[PDB]
């Protein structure tokens, strides 16, 4: 029965190790993502949560009929 239907314990052991590594890395990545999102939303210095401002290319830098703009 063991020869025909099952394998050795080492296969399941090492598969469990691989699964545990994957899950632990995913958990750490999730926590890191939450912290990074909090920091970017609080500070605004990252690529995320970038809210639009006025494009400086719209300004007309020409004389305006008056010396003082």
């Amino acid at each position: 029965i063991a020869r025909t239907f099952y394998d050795g314990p080492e296969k399941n052991y090492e598969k469990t190790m691989a699964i545990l590594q994957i899950e632990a890395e995913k958990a750490e990545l999730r926590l890191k993502e939450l912290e990074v999102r909090r920091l970017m939303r609080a500070r605004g210095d990252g690529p995320w949560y970038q809210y639009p401002t006025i494009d400086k290319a719209l300004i007309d830098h020409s004389p305006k009929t008056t010396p003082d703009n």
Partner: protein, 347 residues
């Protein structure tokens, strides 16, 4: 109505919505809203009757008041900063006017009174349009100004919308009023998460629109507007009733159906922001919507109501007009839960 005129009016409604979508100037957004309302008023009155006239009048009054408040808020924002761009409003009073205006346009509580009456007073096609397409523009405007909203007022209106939608839907025998109260509750759910993640609002919008389109098309196919009229569909079109029952279960948010995913994502996103009490109340209140969906399913598909003798004559005739997208909408309303990670494409 001339078919050409109807096509022109529908295209004008859609073009006003798109003008609201693509504009960077507040005046152009106001113009889009005005054009949308102007082209929308005749569509509610396509089938002429006093009820349709009353519904159109109430709709016009509500939307015109909302537009006046919108313009007044825009003018205040201009006064306190010489800005026309829709980025983030610089005055709290102007922003409160803007929120109240957009909530009145959406029909959020306590500005919900017009939605059930207008929905009941019009045909099923006009009801479909009103409850699906008319939500896009104010929701887009709210998404653009999300960082400026006051969370207290928005969340209060959302919670009120959910509660009032459930309670009002508990008491209805007309199908259009049931759909209107369901729409109010879904709008409350959508606006609850907007201050935290606009992608969740967009996903909830897409799923709600799909389910509402499927439900309205199923109601048009079985030409019923009351509970007892829909009770006869089993004796003529059992497949339609079975699909209706499955879609109703999906609208109730039961897993593993599609309607569960927006609530699930909204709850988890709100818990990310240390918001625990309000999502709990929200789900416990959506239980009421599930209750009246289950009542409709009991009366429509799970049991067999008595029928009339003249149904035998209807047995001999097929449907002359067929809806092309009904099959796709049903599948998307039911079997899309395993495709959840695709929501990242929405941001």
């Amino acid at each position: 109505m001339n078919p050409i005129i109807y096509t022109t009016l529908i295209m004008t409604v859609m073009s006003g919505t798109m003008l609201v979508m693509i504009s960077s100037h507040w005046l152009l957004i106001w113009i889009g809203f005005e054009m949308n309302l102007l082209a929308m008023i005749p569509v509610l009155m396509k089938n002429f009757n006093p009820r349709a006239t009353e519904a159109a009048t109430k709709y016009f009054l509500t939307q015109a008041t909302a537009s006046m408040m919108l313009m007044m808020a825009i003018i205040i924002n201009l006064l306190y900063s010489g800005q026309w761009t829709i980025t983030k409003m610089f005055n709290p009073v102007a922003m409160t006017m803007m929120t109240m205006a957009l909530a009145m346009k959406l029909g959020l509580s306590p500005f919900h009174f017009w939605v059930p009456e207008v929905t009941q007073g019009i045909s099923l096609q006009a009801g479909l349009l009103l409850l699906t397409w008319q939500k896009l523009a104010p929701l887009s405007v709210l998404c653009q100004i999300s960082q400026s909203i006051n969370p207290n007022l928005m969340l209060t209106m959302a919670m009120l919308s959910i509660l009032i939608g459930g309670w009002g839907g508990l008491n209805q025998t007309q199908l259009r009023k049931i759909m209107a109260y369901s729409s109010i509750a879904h709008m409350g759910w959508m606006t609850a998460v907007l201050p935290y993640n606009t992608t969740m609002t967009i996903l909830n919008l897409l799923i709600y629109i799909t389910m509402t389109l499927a439900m309205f098309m199923l109601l048009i196919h079985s030409s019923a507007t009351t509970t007892l009229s829909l009770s006869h569909t089993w004796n003529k079109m059992p497949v339609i009733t079975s699909l209706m029952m499955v879609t109703l279960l999906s609208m109730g948010g039961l897993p593993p159906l599609s309607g569960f995913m927006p609530k699930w994502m909204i709850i988890q996103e709100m818990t990310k922001n240390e918001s625990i009490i309000m999502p709990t109340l929200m789900a416990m209140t959506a239980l009421l919507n599930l209750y009246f969906y289950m009542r409709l399913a009991y009366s429509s598909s799970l049991t067999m109501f008595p029928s009339t003798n003249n149904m035998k004559m209807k047995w001999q005739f097929e449907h002359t007009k067929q809806m092309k997208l009904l099959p796709t909408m049903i599948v998307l309303s039911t079997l899309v839960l395993p495709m959840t990670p695709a929501l990242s494409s929405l941001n």
